[PDB]
Amino acid sequence: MRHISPEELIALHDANISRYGGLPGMSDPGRAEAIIGRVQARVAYEEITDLFEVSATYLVATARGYIFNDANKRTALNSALLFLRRNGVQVFDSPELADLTVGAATGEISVSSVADTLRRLYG
């Protein structure tokens, strides 16, 4: 399946900051690579073939990861949906996405639960 690289995650964040606003820059050099590398390793190791579970893992990992000074939630959401789109899943905006992403970010909504919602919306 087609994954999102750390540098792509960063570029997506930076483009989002430019378009919508927010504080620039990364919290800690290396964290993007650490987190996204972890996601991809886990997907291989756990043999996760379900696109919605994988999208959810990107979403939760970035939302909780504090890779950036700002727009972590935006980057989390857009990257998850970019992931779905690259893998042939049509995506569209839904008024449920904001609260979903916040819930993921605060640790209130698990990967499994995020995947369940994405699957309802887009599957």
Partner: peptide, 18 residues
Amino acid sequence: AEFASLFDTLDSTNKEMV
């Protein structure tokens, strides 16, 4: 353009979350 199209699609939610 990869990103611009994605942001266009999710423009509402992106704005909401700022």
